[PDB]
Coordinates of C-alpha atoms and ligand atoms in Angstrom, one line a residue:
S1 CA 0.1 0.1 -0.1
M2 CA 1.1 3.7 -0.4
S3 CA 2.9 5.0 2.7
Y4 CA 1.1 8.3 2.2
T5 CA -1.7 9.7 -0.1
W6 CA -1.9 13.7 -0.5
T7 CA -4.8 15.8 -1.3
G8 CA -2.8 18.9 -2.6
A9 CA -3.4 21.0 0.8
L10 CA 0.1 22.1 1.7
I11 CA 2.2 21.2 4.7
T12 CA 1.8 24.8 6.2
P13 CA 3.9 26.3 9.1
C14 CA 3.1 26.9 12.9
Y15 CA 20.9 26.7 8.6
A16 CA 17.4 25.5 9.8
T17 CA 14.8 23.3 8.1
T18 CA 11.1 24.9 7.2
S19 CA 7.8 24.1 5.5
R20 CA 9.3 25.1 2.3
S21 CA 11.4 21.9 1.9
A22 CA 8.3 19.8 3.0
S23 CA 7.4 19.0 -0.7
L24 CA 10.9 17.4 -1.4
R25 CA 10.6 15.5 1.8
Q26 CA 6.9 14.0 0.7
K27 CA 8.4 12.7 -2.5
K28 CA 11.0 10.7 -0.8
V29 CA 8.6 9.2 2.0
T30 CA 5.9 8.6 -0.5
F31 CA 6.2 4.9 -2.2
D32 CA 4.2 1.6 -2.3
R33 CA 5.3 -1.1 0.2
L34 CA 5.7 -4.6 -1.2
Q35 CA 6.3 -6.9 1.8
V36 CA 7.0 -10.8 1.5
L37 CA 7.4 -12.7 4.5
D38 CA 8.9 -16.3 5.1
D39 CA 9.7 -18.9 7.8
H40 CA 12.7 -17.1 9.2
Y41 CA 10.5 -13.9 9.9
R42 CA 7.7 -16.1 11.4
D43 CA 10.5 -18.1 13.6
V44 CA 12.1 -14.9 15.0
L45 CA 8.4 -13.5 15.7
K46 CA 7.3 -16.6 17.7
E47 CA 10.7 -16.4 19.7
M48 CA 10.0 -12.7 20.6
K49 CA 6.4 -13.5 21.5
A50 CA 7.4 -16.2 23.8
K51 CA 9.7 -13.6 25.6
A52 CA 6.9 -11.1 25.7
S53 CA 4.6 -13.7 27.3
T54 CA 6.5 -13.3 30.6
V55 CA 5.5 -9.7 31.1
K56 CA 2.8 -8.2 33.2
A57 CA 1.8 -4.7 32.3
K58 CA 0.0 -2.2 34.5
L59 CA -2.8 0.1 33.4
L60 CA -1.7 3.8 34.3
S61 CA -4.3 6.3 36.0
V62 CA -5.1 9.6 34.3
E63 CA -3.0 11.4 36.9
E64 CA 0.0 9.3 36.5
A65 CA -0.2 9.5 32.7
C66 CA -0.4 13.3 33.3
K67 CA 2.6 13.5 35.3
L68 CA 4.7 11.7 32.4
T69 CA 3.7 14.5 30.1
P70 CA 6.8 16.4 28.6
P71 CA 6.5 20.1 29.8
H72 CA 6.9 21.1 26.1
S73 CA 4.5 18.8 24.5
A74 CA 2.3 20.5 22.0
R75 CA -1.0 21.9 23.0
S76 CA -4.5 20.2 22.6
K77 CA -7.0 21.7 20.1
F78 CA -9.4 21.4 23.0
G79 CA -8.4 24.6 25.1
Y80 CA -5.4 23.1 27.3
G81 CA -1.7 22.4 27.4
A82 CA 0.9 20.6 28.7
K83 CA 1.2 22.9 31.9
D84 CA -2.4 22.1 32.5
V85 CA -1.9 18.2 31.9
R86 CA 1.0 18.2 34.4
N87 CA -1.2 20.2 37.2
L88 CA -3.9 17.8 36.7
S89 CA -6.4 20.8 35.9
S90 CA -10.4 19.9 35.6
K91 CA -10.3 20.9 32.1
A92 CA -7.4 18.8 31.1
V93 CA -8.4 15.6 33.2
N94 CA -12.2 15.6 32.1
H95 CA -11.3 15.8 28.3
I96 CA -8.7 13.0 28.8
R97 CA -11.3 10.7 30.5
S98 CA -13.9 11.2 27.7
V99 CA -11.0 10.3 25.1
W100 CA -10.2 7.0 27.2
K101 CA -14.1 6.4 27.3
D102 CA -14.2 6.7 23.3
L103 CA -11.2 4.4 22.8
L104 CA -13.0 1.7 24.9
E105 CA -16.4 2.4 23.1
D106 CA -15.2 3.0 19.5
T107 CA -13.3 0.5 17.7
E108 CA -13.1 1.6 14.0
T109 CA -13.0 5.6 13.3
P110 CA -9.6 6.9 12.4
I111 CA -8.2 9.2 15.1
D112 CA -7.2 12.8 13.5
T113 CA -3.5 13.6 13.6
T114 CA -1.4 16.7 12.8
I115 CA 1.3 16.7 9.9
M116 CA 3.8 19.3 10.5
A117 CA 7.5 20.1 9.0
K118 CA 10.2 19.6 11.8
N119 CA 12.5 22.7 12.4
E120 CA 15.9 21.3 12.7
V121 CA 19.3 22.9 12.7
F122 CA 21.9 21.5 10.3
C123 CA 25.4 22.9 9.0
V124 CA 25.8 24.7 5.7
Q125 CA 27.9 22.0 3.8
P126 CA 28.3 23.0 0.2
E127 CA 31.1 20.2 -0.7
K128 CA 29.8 16.5 -0.8
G129 CA 26.0 16.9 -1.4
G130 CA 23.5 19.7 -0.5
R131 CA 20.9 20.9 2.0
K132 CA 18.4 18.4 3.6
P133 CA 14.6 18.6 3.4
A134 CA 12.5 19.2 6.7
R135 CA 11.7 16.2 8.5
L136 CA 7.7 15.2 8.9
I137 CA 6.3 15.1 12.4
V138 CA 2.8 13.5 12.6
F139 CA 1.1 13.2 16.0
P140 CA -2.2 13.0 17.5
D141 CA -3.8 15.6 19.8
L142 CA -2.7 15.8 23.5
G143 CA -5.6 13.9 24.9
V144 CA -5.0 10.8 23.0
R145 CA -1.1 11.1 23.8
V146 CA -2.1 10.9 27.6
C147 CA -4.3 8.0 26.9
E148 CA -1.6 6.1 25.0
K149 CA 0.4 6.4 28.1
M150 CA -2.4 4.9 30.2
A151 CA -2.6 1.7 28.1
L152 CA 1.1 1.4 26.9
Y153 CA 3.5 3.4 29.0
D154 CA 4.3 0.4 31.3
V155 CA 4.2 -1.9 28.2
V156 CA 7.0 0.5 26.2
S157 CA 9.1 0.5 29.2
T158 CA 9.3 -3.0 30.2
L159 CA 8.5 -5.0 27.1
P160 CA 11.7 -4.3 24.8
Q161 CA 14.2 -5.4 27.2
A162 CA 12.3 -8.5 28.2
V163 CA 11.9 -9.3 24.2
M164 CA 15.3 -8.0 23.0
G165 CA 17.5 -8.6 26.1
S166 CA 21.1 -7.2 25.6
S167 CA 20.1 -6.3 22.1
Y168 CA 18.0 -3.5 23.4
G169 CA 20.1 -0.3 23.0
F170 CA 18.0 2.2 25.1
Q171 CA 18.6 0.4 28.4
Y172 CA 22.4 1.5 28.1
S173 CA 24.4 4.5 29.3
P174 CA 27.1 5.7 26.7
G175 CA 29.7 3.7 28.9
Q176 CA 27.7 0.4 28.9
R177 CA 27.1 0.8 25.0
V178 CA 30.7 1.0 24.2
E179 CA 31.5 -1.9 26.7
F180 CA 28.7 -3.9 24.9
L181 CA 30.1 -3.2 21.4
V182 CA 34.0 -3.9 22.5
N183 CA 33.0 -7.0 24.3
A184 CA 31.1 -8.4 21.4
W185 CA 33.7 -7.5 19.1
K186 CA 36.4 -8.9 21.3
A187 CA 34.4 -12.5 21.7
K188 CA 34.7 -13.1 18.0
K189 CA 37.6 -15.1 16.6
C190 CA 37.6 -12.9 13.4
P191 CA 35.2 -10.1 13.7
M192 CA 33.3 -8.3 11.2
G193 CA 30.6 -5.5 11.7
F194 CA 28.2 -3.3 9.8
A195 CA 25.5 -0.9 10.3
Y196 CA 22.4 -1.1 8.4
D197 CA 20.9 2.2 7.2
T198 CA 17.3 1.7 6.4
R199 CA 15.7 4.4 3.8
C200 CA 12.7 6.3 5.5
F201 CA 12.3 3.7 8.2
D202 CA 9.0 5.1 9.4
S203 CA 7.7 5.3 5.9
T204 CA 8.6 1.4 5.3
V205 CA 6.6 0.2 8.3
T206 CA 3.5 -1.6 6.8
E207 CA 0.1 -2.1 8.3
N208 CA 1.1 -5.6 8.8
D209 CA 4.2 -4.6 11.0
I210 CA 2.0 -2.4 13.2
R211 CA -0.3 -5.3 13.5
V212 CA 2.6 -7.7 14.3
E213 CA 3.8 -5.2 16.9
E214 CA 0.2 -5.2 18.4
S215 CA 0.4 -9.1 18.4
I216 CA 3.5 -8.8 20.6
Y217 CA 1.9 -6.3 23.1
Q218 CA -1.1 -8.7 23.5
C219 CA 1.3 -11.2 24.8
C220 CA 1.5 -9.2 28.2
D221 CA -0.7 -9.5 31.2
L222 CA -3.1 -6.9 30.6
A223 CA -6.1 -5.2 32.3
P224 CA -9.0 -5.5 30.0
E225 CA -9.5 -1.8 29.4
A226 CA -5.7 -1.8 28.4
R227 CA -6.2 -4.7 25.9
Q228 CA -9.3 -2.8 24.2
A229 CA -7.1 0.4 24.1
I230 CA -4.1 -1.3 22.5
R231 CA -6.6 -2.7 20.2
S232 CA -8.5 0.6 19.3
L233 CA -5.2 2.5 19.3
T234 CA -3.9 -0.1 16.6
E235 CA -6.7 0.1 14.2
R236 CA -7.7 3.8 14.8
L237 CA -4.3 5.4 15.0
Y238 CA -1.2 3.3 14.7
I239 CA -1.8 1.7 11.2
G240 CA -2.6 5.0 9.8
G241 CA -5.3 7.7 9.5
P242 CA -6.2 11.2 8.1
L243 CA -3.4 14.0 8.2
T244 CA -4.5 17.7 8.9
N245 CA -2.1 20.6 8.5
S246 CA -1.7 23.4 11.0
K247 CA -4.6 25.6 9.1
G248 CA -6.9 22.5 9.9
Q249 CA -7.1 21.3 6.3
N250 CA -7.1 17.7 5.1
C251 CA -3.6 17.1 3.9
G252 CA -3.7 13.5 3.0
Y253 CA -3.6 9.9 4.6
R254 CA -1.1 8.0 6.5
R255 CA -0.6 4.2 5.9
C256 CA 2.8 3.9 7.6
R257 CA 4.4 4.7 11.2
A258 CA 3.4 8.1 12.7
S259 CA 6.8 9.7 14.1
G260 CA 4.7 11.3 17.3
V261 CA 2.9 8.4 18.8
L262 CA 4.1 6.5 22.2
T263 CA 4.9 3.5 20.3
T264 CA 7.0 4.9 17.7
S265 CA 10.4 4.2 19.4
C266 CA 9.3 0.8 20.9
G267 CA 7.6 -0.2 17.9
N268 CA 10.6 0.7 15.5
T269 CA 12.9 -1.3 17.7
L270 CA 11.0 -4.4 17.6
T271 CA 10.1 -4.1 13.9
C272 CA 13.9 -3.5 13.3
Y273 CA 15.0 -6.2 15.5
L274 CA 12.6 -8.6 14.0
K275 CA 13.4 -8.1 10.4
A276 CA 17.2 -7.7 11.1
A277 CA 17.3 -11.2 13.2
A278 CA 15.3 -12.8 10.3
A279 CA 17.6 -11.4 7.7
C280 CA 20.8 -12.6 9.6
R281 CA 19.4 -16.2 9.3
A282 CA 18.5 -15.8 5.4
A283 CA 22.0 -14.4 4.9
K284 CA 23.6 -17.1 7.1
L285 CA 25.6 -14.8 9.1
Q286 CA 27.7 -16.7 11.9
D287 CA 27.3 -15.7 15.5
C288 CA 25.5 -12.3 15.2
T289 CA 25.3 -9.8 17.9
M290 CA 22.8 -6.9 17.2
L291 CA 22.4 -3.7 18.9
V292 CA 19.1 -1.8 18.1
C293 CA 17.9 1.7 18.9
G294 CA 14.8 2.6 16.9
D295 CA 15.7 2.2 13.3
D296 CA 19.2 2.3 14.2
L297 CA 21.0 -1.1 13.7
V298 CA 24.6 -2.4 14.0
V299 CA 25.4 -6.2 13.7
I300 CA 28.7 -7.8 14.8
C301 CA 29.6 -11.3 13.6
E302 CA 32.3 -14.0 12.7
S303 CA 33.9 -13.2 9.5
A304 CA 33.6 -16.0 6.6
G305 CA 36.3 -14.4 4.5
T306 CA 36.1 -11.0 2.4
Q307 CA 34.2 -12.3 -0.7
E308 CA 31.9 -14.3 1.6
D309 CA 31.2 -11.4 3.6
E310 CA 30.4 -9.2 0.7
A311 CA 27.7 -11.8 -0.5
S312 CA 26.3 -12.4 2.9
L313 CA 25.6 -8.6 3.3
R314 CA 23.9 -8.5 -0.2
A315 CA 21.6 -11.5 1.0
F316 CA 21.1 -9.7 4.3
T317 CA 20.0 -6.6 2.2
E318 CA 17.9 -8.8 -0.1
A319 CA 16.2 -10.2 3.1
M320 CA 15.6 -6.9 4.6
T321 CA 14.5 -5.4 1.3
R322 CA 11.9 -8.2 1.0
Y323 CA 10.8 -7.3 4.6
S324 CA 10.2 -3.7 3.5
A325 CA 13.3 -2.3 5.1
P326 CA 15.3 -1.3 1.8
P327 CA 18.9 0.3 2.5
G328 CA 19.5 4.0 2.1
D329 CA 23.3 3.4 1.8
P330 CA 24.2 -0.2 0.8
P331 CA 25.9 -1.6 4.0
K332 CA 29.9 -2.4 4.1
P333 CA 31.7 -5.0 6.1
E334 CA 34.1 -3.5 8.6
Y335 CA 37.0 -5.3 10.3
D336 CA 38.0 -2.5 12.4
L337 CA 35.3 -1.4 15.2
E338 CA 36.0 2.3 15.0
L339 CA 35.0 2.4 11.3
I340 CA 31.4 1.7 12.2
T341 CA 28.8 4.5 12.6
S342 CA 25.9 3.5 14.7
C343 CA 23.5 6.1 16.6
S344 CA 25.6 8.7 14.7
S345 CA 28.4 7.7 16.8
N346 CA 31.8 5.6 16.5
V347 CA 34.0 3.8 19.1
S348 CA 37.4 5.4 19.5
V349 CA 40.4 5.0 21.8
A350 CA 42.2 7.1 24.3
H351 CA 44.2 6.6 27.5
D352 CA 43.1 7.4 31.0
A353 CA 45.6 8.7 33.9
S354 CA 47.0 5.3 34.7
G355 CA 47.7 4.7 30.9
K356 CA 45.1 2.1 30.3
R357 CA 43.6 1.9 26.7
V358 CA 39.9 3.2 27.2
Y359 CA 36.8 3.0 24.7
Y360 CA 34.4 6.0 24.3
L361 CA 31.7 7.0 21.7
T362 CA 32.3 10.0 19.6
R363 CA 30.9 11.5 16.5
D364 CA 31.6 14.5 14.0
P365 CA 31.1 17.6 16.2
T366 CA 29.7 19.9 13.3
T367 CA 26.1 19.3 14.1
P368 CA 26.4 19.5 17.9
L369 CA 28.5 22.7 17.7
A370 CA 26.2 24.4 15.2
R371 CA 23.2 23.4 17.3
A372 CA 24.9 25.0 20.3
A373 CA 25.7 28.2 18.5
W374 CA 22.0 28.6 17.4
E375 CA 20.9 28.1 21.1
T376 CA 23.4 30.5 22.2
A377 CA 22.0 33.2 19.5
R378 CA 18.2 32.2 20.0
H379 CA 15.9 31.2 23.2
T380 CA 15.4 27.5 23.0
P381 CA 13.3 25.4 25.6
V382 CA 15.6 22.4 24.9
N383 CA 19.2 22.7 25.1
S384 CA 21.0 20.1 22.8
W385 CA 24.3 21.2 24.0
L386 CA 23.6 19.8 27.7
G387 CA 22.3 16.5 26.1
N388 CA 25.7 16.4 24.1
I389 CA 27.8 17.4 27.1
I390 CA 26.3 14.5 28.9
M391 CA 26.2 11.9 26.1
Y392 CA 29.7 12.7 24.7
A393 CA 31.3 14.0 28.1
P394 CA 34.6 11.9 27.2
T395 CA 35.3 13.5 23.8
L396 CA 37.9 15.9 23.2
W397 CA 35.2 18.5 21.6
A398 CA 32.7 18.2 24.5
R399 CA 35.3 18.6 27.0
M400 CA 37.5 21.5 25.4
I401 CA 34.6 23.5 23.5
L402 CA 31.1 22.7 24.9
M403 CA 32.1 22.3 28.6
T404 CA 34.4 25.4 28.5
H405 CA 31.9 27.7 26.6
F406 CA 28.9 27.0 28.6
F407 CA 30.5 26.9 32.2
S408 CA 31.9 30.4 31.1
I409 CA 28.4 31.9 30.2
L410 CA 27.1 30.1 33.3
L411 CA 29.6 31.5 35.6
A412 CA 29.1 35.0 34.0
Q413 CA 25.3 34.9 34.2
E414 CA 25.2 33.4 37.8
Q415 CA 23.2 30.5 36.4
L416 CA 25.2 27.4 37.5
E417 CA 22.5 26.4 40.1
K418 CA 19.6 26.9 37.6
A419 CA 18.3 23.6 36.5
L420 CA 17.8 23.1 32.8
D421 CA 15.6 21.0 30.6
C422 CA 17.3 18.2 28.6
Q423 CA 15.9 15.6 26.2
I424 CA 17.8 12.5 25.4
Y425 CA 16.3 10.3 22.6
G426 CA 13.0 11.1 24.2
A427 CA 13.7 10.9 27.8
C428 CA 13.2 14.4 29.5
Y429 CA 15.4 15.6 32.4
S430 CA 16.1 18.6 34.5
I431 CA 19.7 19.0 35.4
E432 CA 21.5 21.7 37.4
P433 CA 24.9 22.2 35.7
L434 CA 26.4 22.0 39.0
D435 CA 25.5 18.3 39.2
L436 CA 27.3 17.3 35.9
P437 CA 30.4 15.6 37.5
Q438 CA 28.3 13.1 39.4
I439 CA 26.2 12.4 36.2
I440 CA 29.3 12.0 34.1
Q441 CA 30.9 9.6 36.2
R442 CA 27.9 7.2 36.4
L443 CA 27.3 7.5 32.5
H444 CA 31.1 7.1 31.5
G445 CA 33.1 6.0 34.3
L446 CA 35.7 8.2 36.2
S447 CA 38.2 7.9 33.3
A448 CA 36.1 10.5 31.4
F449 CA 37.7 13.4 33.4
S450 CA 41.3 11.8 32.5
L451 CA 41.1 10.8 28.9
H452 CA 44.3 12.0 26.8
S453 CA 46.2 10.6 23.9
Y454 CA 43.2 11.0 21.6
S455 CA 43.5 9.3 18.1
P456 CA 45.1 11.7 15.4
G457 CA 42.1 11.2 13.1
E458 CA 40.0 12.3 16.0
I459 CA 42.0 15.4 16.9
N460 CA 42.1 16.2 13.2
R461 CA 38.4 15.9 12.8
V462 CA 37.9 18.3 15.9
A463 CA 40.4 20.8 14.5
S464 CA 39.2 20.9 10.9
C465 CA 35.5 21.3 12.3
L466 CA 36.5 24.4 14.1
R467 CA 38.3 26.1 11.3
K468 CA 35.4 25.2 9.1
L469 CA 33.0 26.7 11.7
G470 CA 35.1 29.9 12.5
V471 CA 35.5 28.6 16.0
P472 CA 38.8 29.6 18.0
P473 CA 41.3 26.8 17.9
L474 CA 41.9 24.2 21.0
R475 CA 44.7 26.5 22.1
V476 CA 42.0 29.3 22.8
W477 CA 39.8 26.8 24.4
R478 CA 42.9 25.6 26.9
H479 CA 43.3 29.3 27.8
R480 CA 39.8 29.9 28.4
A481 CA 39.1 26.8 30.3
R482 CA 42.0 27.5 32.6
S483 CA 40.1 30.7 33.5
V484 CA 36.6 29.0 34.1
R485 CA 38.4 26.2 36.2
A486 CA 40.1 29.0 38.3
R487 CA 36.8 31.0 39.0
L488 CA 35.0 27.7 39.6
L489 CA 37.5 26.2 42.4
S490 CA 37.3 29.8 44.0
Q491 CA 33.6 29.0 44.6
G492 CA 33.9 25.8 46.8
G493 CA 30.9 23.7 47.0
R494 CA 29.8 21.9 43.8
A495 CA 31.3 24.8 41.6
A496 CA 34.6 23.6 43.1
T497 CA 34.0 19.8 42.1
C498 CA 33.1 21.1 38.5
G499 CA 36.4 23.1 38.4
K500 CA 38.4 19.9 39.6
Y501 CA 36.8 17.0 37.6
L502 CA 35.6 18.8 34.5
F503 CA 38.9 20.8 33.6
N504 CA 41.7 19.0 35.0
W505 CA 42.7 18.6 31.2
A506 CA 43.4 22.2 31.0
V507 CA 46.1 22.5 33.7
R508 CA 49.8 21.3 33.5
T509 CA 50.0 20.3 37.3
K510 CA 47.0 18.3 37.4
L511 CA 45.0 17.0 40.6
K512 CA 44.7 13.3 41.2
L513 CA 41.0 12.6 40.6
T514 CA 39.4 10.0 43.0
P515 CA 35.6 8.8 42.9
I516 CA 33.2 11.7 43.5
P517 CA 31.6 11.7 47.0
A518 CA 28.1 12.5 45.6
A519 CA 28.0 9.2 43.3
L520 CA 23.9 6.7 41.9
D521 CA 20.2 7.1 41.0
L522 CA 19.8 8.9 37.6
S523 CA 15.8 8.7 37.5
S524 CA 16.1 11.4 39.9
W525 CA 16.7 14.0 37.3
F526 CA 13.9 12.1 35.4
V527 CA 10.8 14.4 34.4
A528 CA 8.4 13.0 31.8
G529 CA 9.1 10.9 28.3
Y530 CA 11.0 7.8 27.6
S531 CA 10.6 8.0 23.7
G532 CA 6.8 8.9 23.0
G533 CA 5.3 12.2 24.2
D534 CA 5.6 15.5 22.4
Ligands
23E1 O1 45.2 32.3 18.2 C1 44.5 32.0 17.1 O2 45.1 31.6 16.1 C2 43.0 32.1 17.1 C3 42.6 33.4 17.7 C4 41.0 33.4 17.7 C5 40.0 33.2 16.8 C6 38.7 33.6 16.8 C7 38.3 34.1 18.0 N1 37.0 34.5 18.3 C8 36.4 35.1 19.1 O3 37.3 35.5 20.2 C9 35.1 35.4 19.2 N2 34.3 34.2 19.1 C10 34.3 33.2 19.9 O4 35.0 33.2 20.9 C11 33.6 31.9 19.5 C12 33.0 31.2 20.5 C13 32.2 29.9 20.3 C14 31.9 30.0 18.9 C15 31.0 28.9 18.4 C16 30.1 27.9 19.1 C17 31.1 26.7 19.7 C18 30.1 25.7 20.5 C19 29.4 26.4 21.7 C20 28.4 27.5 21.0 C21 29.2 28.4 20.2 C22 30.9 29.2 17.0 N3 31.6 30.4 16.8 C23 32.2 30.8 18.0 C24 33.1 31.7 18.2 C25 31.8 30.9 15.4 C26 30.5 31.6 15.0 O5 30.5 32.7 15.1 N4 29.3 30.9 15.0 C27 29.4 29.4 15.0 C28 28.6 28.7 14.1 C29 28.4 27.2 13.9 C30 29.2 26.6 14.9 C31 29.9 27.1 15.7 C32 30.2 28.6 16.1 C33 34.6 36.4 20.5 C34 34.1 37.6 20.1 C35 35.0 37.9 18.7 C36 34.7 36.5 18.1 C37 39.3 34.4 19.0 C38 40.6 34.1 19.1
46F2 C1 25.5 7.0 21.2 O1 25.6 6.5 22.4 C2 24.2 6.3 22.9 C3 24.4 5.7 24.3 C4 23.3 5.3 24.9 C5 22.0 5.4 24.3 C6 20.6 5.0 25.1 N1 20.6 5.8 26.4 C7 19.8 7.2 26.3 O2 19.2 7.5 25.3 C8 19.6 7.5 27.6 C9 18.1 8.3 27.8 N2 17.5 7.0 28.0 C10 16.4 6.6 27.2 C11 16.1 7.0 25.9 C12 15.0 6.2 25.3 C13 14.3 5.2 25.8 CL1 12.9 4.6 25.2 N3 14.7 4.9 27.1 N4 15.8 5.3 27.8 C14 17.5 6.4 29.4 C15 19.0 5.6 29.2 N5 20.0 6.5 28.5 S1 21.4 7.0 29.5 O3 22.2 7.4 28.5 O4 21.5 5.9 30.4 C16 20.9 8.3 30.6 C17 20.4 7.9 31.8 C18 20.0 9.1 32.5 C19 20.3 10.4 32.3 O5 19.9 11.1 33.3 C20 20.7 12.4 33.3 F1 20.3 13.1 32.5 F2 20.4 12.8 34.7 F3 22.0 12.2 33.2 C21 20.7 10.8 31.1 C22 21.3 9.6 30.2 C23 21.8 6.0 23.0 C24 23.1 6.4 22.3

C-alpha cells in the first residue's frame, strides 16, 4: 500500500529546516510497500512473542499518565496544554477521561493527526551534497497522547528489554554501549561488523508490521481496558489515518508509522530487530550480536572471508528489502570497530591517567557545535548542548569546547545552580549544571575526566571542524578553560567539584581524581518521556 496519499493541501507552518522543503520530503517518503514474509521472519516472531509472554503490564491512571507528559508537549486543540496536564487541571483531566471512554467504546473510527514540518538545525555544507529537506512530524492530539500512556507506558518501558535482552540499545548509558560493542567485538575469533541504514524507516513500516507489533503487546498480562485501548489505538491510530495541517485542512492519509505516537521508538526497535534477526538467518551470518535503537542497527559477527562477507551482506540486504526495509546506503563489512557508525557515533580509543586503553563513543562535532551556536543566538526550551555534554562527556570536543563555553557563560550569568531541561532520545530530564560531574561519572566512568592521547584522526576531525565553523582553535579553548577552572575552584561547594573534575585536562599540574563523593540514581533527574510524548 502507499505509505502516504496527499490531497494537494500544503504542509503549512506553525541553517534551519522549514515547511518550504516539506514538498521534497513528501516525494522521498511517498512510495508503495511490497512486503514478502518467510519462515525465518515467522520463527523470530514466535521467539519474540514467547519472551513477551513473561511480561505483566499495569494500566496507568489519568494522573500518573499526566505526570509523564513532557513540559513542552504540543497543546491540545481542545483548550489546554502540557502545563494544564501536568497540574491535573479539571479541563485537561475531564477531556482525557472522555478520550479514554471513546477508545474503549469506538473500535473503528480513525483518529485525527497533525502533519507538521520539523524545524531542525544542520550545518551549511556545500561540498559532498546539498541541504536536507525538513523531516515530517505526525502526532495525535494531547488528549490521545495521555491515553496512549495509560494503556502502553508500562508496556513500552518494560517489554523491549524482556523481548530483546542485551540487543535493546535504550537500556544503556554511553559507557555501557561501548562496553557491549567492544565485548561483542572481542568475543569473535575474526570479527566483522556493519551498520544497516534503512531508507525512510517510518515510511517502510507496513500496516502488517504495526499489527505484528500489536500481536507482541497482546502477549503481556494486561487489564481488559488496556487490552481494548491497544486494539483501538492499533486500528484507529497506529496503522494509519487522516493527516491535518496547521491550518486545519485535510492534507492526506498515512498508512505507515506516525513519528509522534508513544509506540514509535518501541515499535521501530521491535520491527527493526525482527526484520534484522530474520535477515541474519537468511544471509547465514555466523554468531551475530545485534544492537538496536529505533531504526538504528549494528550487527557484529564472525567473518567468513572477504568475498563471503560481501555476498552475505547482499543476502542480508535482499532479505531486509523483502521485509520492507530497503537500504539508504548499501551496508559494508568493517574489520575495525572504529570504522562503524551507529547512533550517529563511533568507537574511538584514548588513554586514562593510569595509561590504560579506554574506549568511548564519539561523532563529527559539526552538528552538535552548530546546534549549540544557534541555542546561544536564540531562546530555546531544549538545550541540545547539555544533552551533548552529557552523552559525549569523554570526547575532546565536548570537554574543550562545550564544557568551557557553557561553564563560562553560566559563571558570567550566575546561572550554575539553575536547572535546565534536557531531552535524550525522548527521555526528558531537569539538570542543574553543578551536578554534571556525578552524572558523567555514572554514565561514562571516572576515566572521562582523565582521557588524553586521543587518536590523530579524531584530533584532526575536531581541529578541521573548528576551522570550518570559524571557532577559535583548541589552544584558545585551553586558555579559556584555565580561567573558568580558576573562578569555579574559588567558589567551593559543587562549583569547585566542577572545576576539579571537568577541567583537569586544562592544567599542567593536574589533580589526582578519585571517585566523586556524591556518586547513583539517575531517575531522580527524570521528568516525563521515555521515547513517546511531544
Ligand atoms: O590564536 C589563534 O590563532 C586564534 C585566535 C582566535 C580566533 C577567533 C576568536 N573568536 C572570538 O574571540 C570570538 N568568538 C568566539 O570566541 C566563539 C566562541 C564560540 C563559538 C561557536 C560555538 C562553539 C560551541 C558552543 C556554541 C558556540 C561558534 N563560533 C564561535 C566563536 C563561530 C560563530 O560565530 N558561529 C558558530 C556557528 C556554527 C558553529 C560554531 C560557531 C569572541 C568575540 C570575537 C569572536 C578568538 C581568537
Ligand atoms: C551514542 O551513544 C548512545 C548511548 C546510549 C543510548 C541510550 N540511552 C539513552 O538514550 C539515555 C536516555 N534513556 C532513554 C532513551 C530512550 C528510551 Cl526509550 N529509554 N531510555 C535512558 C537511558 N539513557 S542513559 O544514557 O543511560 C541516561 C540515563 C540517565 C540520564 O539522566 C541524566 F540526564 F540525569 F543524566 C541521562 C542519560 C543511546 C546512544
